Design a protein around this ligand. Structure first.
Ligand SMILES: CC(C)c1cc2ncccc2[nH]1
Length: 435
């Protein structure tokens, strides 16, 4: 696996031991061969679990999710997928790793796709080796892979709104359920319905993940309501998964705005990972998987792959060369390598709008490419009235950095900046010049 010019896909089924058994063996061999190695975790939660599995081995943890005293003797680095892509974009030198290991390599967030693209290009060039660890590599068509113990799979109508009758099976259960919803707003409604029925519910999403996931270990719960983020190696002591089989799809329309289309079907890879949360204990057969729709290849034309090309076009590889997307996911976007390459000052603005501004990649690119500087927020207010952002069915308003009350009406509208209350609160703070 460790030879230069080789990319291996470690596709053992979910729960087969890729992280706790195989990963430490790979790391020991890499250290024996003096290979400068990077290990990429999808989340801070997975980074902390990796430290437990690799404890005793000389690994430099480039994350505050682990409190360790590094010796300075480490040639193996561990960081999140997003951190790797961020450091590549910034004017910080990233070592040319001889071995690149990505855990939960199916992650479809733009920084994860860009990291696979950069790594696979280095391997293709003959410069490095790579190992992508996932039960569901890109283009997998099997939503029902093997498990540690038999699973009871049942196709059934799953509620996506509060209900008063017709779904007794949901609440009659006495175990612990993990329920995948298509959005934070949809989970809020289902959680409120379950709480009204006497259930103890924890909600998980990208922005709350680390904090709320700790509650699944610290307190008793009946349901965990989560978005697709729990497909990335989140483990639960549960006996049932309820899966809506739905997700939202960001779509760029006329190259001018981004909408959150759907809810629409998940991919086979996502369905297999949602199901993969249960059937993990060989001593507990009969965990249930209830699924409420079919699968489809909804990653085709999904904005994350176009956003990954915007990131890769702005990462130095060698002279004017630009990294390609990883071959099995390269057709998900119709884009020319290099079309989003920015000049030095516009590139720095694009990076700061993502890193400090916390803007979606597509929106950060529109602002930087228009020649606007990071702190200039006039674009948040000079769009057409069809770009007015609404709060509780009335236009959202903020006090500008000049002390003037204005309606939020961005020049470019990206639905992700107002997808839920927390996102809109963050965007209002940005529009006001507060970061
Ligand atoms: C634990 C945190 C503070 C951290 C460690 C580290 N090492 C190298 C480069 C960046 C780094 N960040």
């Amino acid at each position: 696996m460790l030879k230069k010019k080789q990319l291996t896909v470690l596709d053992l089924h979910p729960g087969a031991g890729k992280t706790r058994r195989v990963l430490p063996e790979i790391v020991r061999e890499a250290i024996k061969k003096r290979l400068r190695t990077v290990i990429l975790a999808p989340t801070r939660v997975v980074a902390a679990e990796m430290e437990e599995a690799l404890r005793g081995l000389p690994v430099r943890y480039m994350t505050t999710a682990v409190n360790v005293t590094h010796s300075g003797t480490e040639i193996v680095d561990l960081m999140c997928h997003a951190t790797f892509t961020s450091r590549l974009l910034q004017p910080i030198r990233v070592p040319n790793y001889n071995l690149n290991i990505m855990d939960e390599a199916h992650f479809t967030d733009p920084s994860s796709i860009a990291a696979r693209g950069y790594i696979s290009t280095r391997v293709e060039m003959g410069e490095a080796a790579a190992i992508f660890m996932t039960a569901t590599p890109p283009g997998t068509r099997d939503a029902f892979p093997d498990s540690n113990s038999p699973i009871m799979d049942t196709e059934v109508e799953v509620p996506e709104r509060a209900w008063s009758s017709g779904f007794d099976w949901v609440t009659d259960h006495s175990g612990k359920t993990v329920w995948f919803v298509p959005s934070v707003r949809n989970g809020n409604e289902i959680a409120a319905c379950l709480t009204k029925a006497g259930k103890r519910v924890i909600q998980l999403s990208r922005k709350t993940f680390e904090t709320e996931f700790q509650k699944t270990k610290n307190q008793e719960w009946d349901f965990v309501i989560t978005t697709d983020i729990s497909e990335m190696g989140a483990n639960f002591k549960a006996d049932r998964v309820i899966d809506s089989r739905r997700c939202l799809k960001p779509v760029i329309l006329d190259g001018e705005r981004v909408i959150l289309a759907g809810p629409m079907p998940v991919t086979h890879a996502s369905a297999a990972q949602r199901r993969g949360r249960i059937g993990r204990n060989p001593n507990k057969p009969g965990d249930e998987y209830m699924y409420g729709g079919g699968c489809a290849e909804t990653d085709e034309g999904h904005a994350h792959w176009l956003e990954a090309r915007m990131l890769l076009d702005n990462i130095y590889l060698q002279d004017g060369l630009i990294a390609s997307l990883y071959r099995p996911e390269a057709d998900k976007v119709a884009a020319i390598e290099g079309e989003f390459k920015l000049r030095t000052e516009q590139r720095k603005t694009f990076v700061e709008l993502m890193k400090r501004g916390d803007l979606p990649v597509w929106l950060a690119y529109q602002v930087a490419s228009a020649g606007i500087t990071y702190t200039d927020r006039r674009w948040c207010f000079d769009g057409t009235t069809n770009n007015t952002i609404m709060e509780d069915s009335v236009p959202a308003e903020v006090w500008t950095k000049y002390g003037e009350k204005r309606v939020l009406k961005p020049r470019w509208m990206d639905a992700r900046v107002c997808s839920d209350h927390a996102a809109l609160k963050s965007f209002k703070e940005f529009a006001a010049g507060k970061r």
